[PDB]
Ligand binder design. Structure first.
Ligand SMILES: CN1CCN(C(=O)N2C[C@H](CN)C[C@H](C(=O)Nc3ccc(Cl)c(F)c3)C2)CC1
Ligand SMILES: *[C@@H]1O[C@H](CO)[C@@H](O)[C@H](O)[C@H]1NC(C)=O
Ligand SMILES: *[C@@H]1O[C@H](CO)[C@@H](O)[C@H](O)[C@H]1NC(C)=O
Ligand SMILES: *[C@@H]1O[C@H](CO)[C@@H](O)[C@H](O)[C@H]1NC(C)=O
Ligand SMILES: *[C@@H]1O[C@H](CO)[C@@H](O)[C@H](O)[C@H]1NC(C)=O
Ligand SMILES: *[C@@H]1O[C@H](CO)[C@@H](O)[C@H](O)[C@H]1NC(C)=O
Ligand SMILES: *[C@@H]1O[C@H](CO)[C@@H](O)[C@H](O)[C@H]1NC(C)=O
Ligand SMILES: *[C@@H]1O[C@H](CO)[C@@H](O)[C@H](O)[C@H]1NC(C)=O
Ligand SMILES: *[C@@H]1O[C@H](CO)[C@@H](O)[C@H](O)[C@H]1NC(C)=O
Ligand SMILES: *[C@@H]1O[C@H](CO)[C@@H](O)[C@H](O)[C@H]1NC(C)=O
Ligand SMILES: *[C@@H]1O[C@H](CO)[C@@H](O)[C@H](O)[C@H]1NC(C)=O
Ligand SMILES: *[C@@H]1O[C@H](CO)[C@@H](O)[C@H](O)[C@H]1NC(C)=O
Ligand SMILES: *[C@@H]1O[C@H](CO)[C@@H](O)[C@H](O)[C@H]1NC(C)=O
Length: 340
């Protein structure tokens, strides 16, 4: 019953249905094992551990998989990679991320912080031990984190160094905000997302107050990104295979804290993407026919605070994204690998 921080090679578990053609099911059928049918965590009594979500290998462990997963599934007609043009087959596929678990091999375990207000760094008091993590959907997105877990109590602000403006801030919402995005049946690339103005605005209000506590009640200001390539300037995600690019100016720019209706963001489905796995562009074919719809829960926000504001009374925050390791860090933050 003693251990030390260490890294090893993990394996995955998921409930992939062997028959299903959906790319995540297929990727998990041949690369992951069946989920533990008999899990049991082991509370360690009055044991206090330290965690660090910004420096956790599990996150790089998951990243590598999703990159492998996307490489063998979601695959472009043409891939441009620093002066190369590999052409390929690019058939429309079935895409809907499932949860995947991360388990340790014999000789190690994962420590799971259960402080409902854990921020991801430092000390944790109620510490549990698990063999595998819970089911995590590997949802790829910028600006908004969708379909994830929620914070159990207060909205949590996660960062490696709040004081360093270069380090990303992950907001962990305690209440989700539904976001419905549709590309109507037959511009075929035109689409949009609908969001409750009231709900979203109340949540953003609350978020503002949280950041207030972390930044000496200094005026909090939200704005959209200042410069970017579209993947970052817009809220980007994949819905049923298609890459959606939505303009979130109406969430971070009306402030509005008579505005309380249904926010409607304009989006566009882009065949040509700047990849997240590695630098390069990938070009897909045009969209599939019929209404393409994905309703998702917004569960977190990726923010970047402005710099050089030290001499003012304001703090400016803009939605960020691009590095997916932060998206995985969004769910894995409470886990840590220790060798027995
Ligand atoms: C650093 N590391 C290595 C290479 N990367 C880049 O160069 N990126 C820059 C690029 C614009 N310049 C945006 C990229 C991005 O996020 N693409 C993206 C694609 C599809 C979806 Cl669905 C999505 F949500 C996002 C991030 C990845 C990060
Ligand atoms: C510690 O977390 C575990 C996980 O559910 C649970 O027993 C309870 O929330 C906490 N226990 C105590 C004694 O606080
Ligand atoms: C969410 O957390 C905030 C604190 O940031 C709190 O005021 C609010 O009541 C919480 N709401 C829910 C639904 O948990
Ligand atoms: C996280 O919590 C620890 C301990 O309470 C604290 O030292 C650290 O500053 C916190 N980080 C943030 C971003 O709140
Ligand atoms: C946090 O950022 C500030 C500003 O760059 C820096 O001076 C400080 O050393 C950072 N904290 C740590 C622990 O490095
Ligand atoms: C989502 O949007 C479409 C089109 O506006 C609508 O038909 C549907 O009822 C909305 N809600 C859900 C849960 O799909
Ligand atoms: C938006 O959510 C609020 C609760 O915050 C609710 O009163 C209202 O019915 C919702 N709006 C719509 C159009 O469903
Ligand atoms: C922020 O303002 C609130 C006012 O409700 C006050 O109670 C609190 O002490 C202030 N905190 C800081 C860090 O300025
Ligand atoms: C998003 O829409 C607003 C208008 O609502 C526009 O000013 C802005 O340029 C758009 N964003 C981008 C990156 O084009
Ligand atoms: C929103 O901010 C953007 C700056 O990127 C700009 O289009 C616009 O002036 C702002 N909104 C309003 C209502 O002025
Ligand atoms: C979120 O989950 C819903 C229900 O499982 C799904 O229909 C939707 O496609 C998911 N969103 C994304 C972006 O994958
Ligand atoms: C969206 O949120 C509701 C309530 O927070 C939850 O019951 C539901 O499972 C969430 N959807 C997904 C796809 O996780
Ligand atoms: C802004 O303030 C932080 C901490 O107060 C400091 O670490 C950082 O270097 C400052 N930035 C500039 C440009 O002075």
């Amino acid at each position: 019953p003693v251990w030390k921080d260490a890294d090893t090679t993990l394996f995955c578990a998921s409930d992939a249905k062997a028959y299903e053609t959906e790319v995540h099911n297929v990727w998990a059928t041949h690369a992951c094992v069946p989920t533990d049918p008999n899990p049991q965590e082991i509370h360690l009594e009055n044991v206090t551990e330290n965690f660090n979500m910004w420096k956790n290998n599990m996150v790089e462990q998951m990243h590598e998989d999703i990159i492998s997963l996307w490489d063998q599934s979601l695959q472009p007609c043409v891939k441009l990679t620093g002066g190369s043009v590999i052409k390929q087959a690019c058939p429309k596929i079935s895409f809907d991320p499932i949860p995947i678990h991360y388990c340790t091999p014999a000789g190690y375990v994962i420590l799971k912080c259960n402080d409902k207000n854990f921020n991801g760094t430092g000390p944790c008091k109620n510490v549990s031990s698990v063999q595998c993590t819970h089911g995590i959907k590997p949802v790829v997105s910028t600006q908004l984190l969708l379909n994830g877990s929620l914070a159990e109590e207060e909205i949590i602000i996660r960062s490696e160094n709040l004081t360093n403006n270069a380090k990303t801030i992950i907001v962990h919402l305690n209440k989700s905000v539904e976001i419905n995005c549709t590309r109507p049946s037959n511009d075929i690339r035109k689409a949009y997302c609908e969001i409750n103005g009231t709900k979203w605005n109340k949540v953003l209000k609350q978020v503002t107050e949280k950041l207030k506590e972390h930044f000496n009640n200094k005026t909090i200001i939200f704005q959209p990104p200042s410069g970017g390539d579209l993947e970052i300037t817009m809220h980007t995600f994949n819905c049923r295979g298609e890459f959606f690019y939505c303009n979130t100016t109406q969430l971070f720019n009306n402030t509005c804290i008579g505005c309380n209706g249904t926010i409607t963001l304009p989006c566009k489905i882009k065949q040509i993407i700047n990849m997240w796995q590695g630098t390069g562009q990938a070009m897909y074919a045009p969209p599939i026919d019929g209404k393409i719809n994905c309703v998702s829960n917004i569960t977190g926000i990726l923010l970047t605070r402005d710099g050089g504001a030290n001499n003012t009374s304001n703090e400016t925050f803009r939605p960020g994204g691009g590095d997916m390791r932060d998206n995985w860090r969004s769910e894995l933050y409470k886990y840590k690998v220790v060798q027995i």
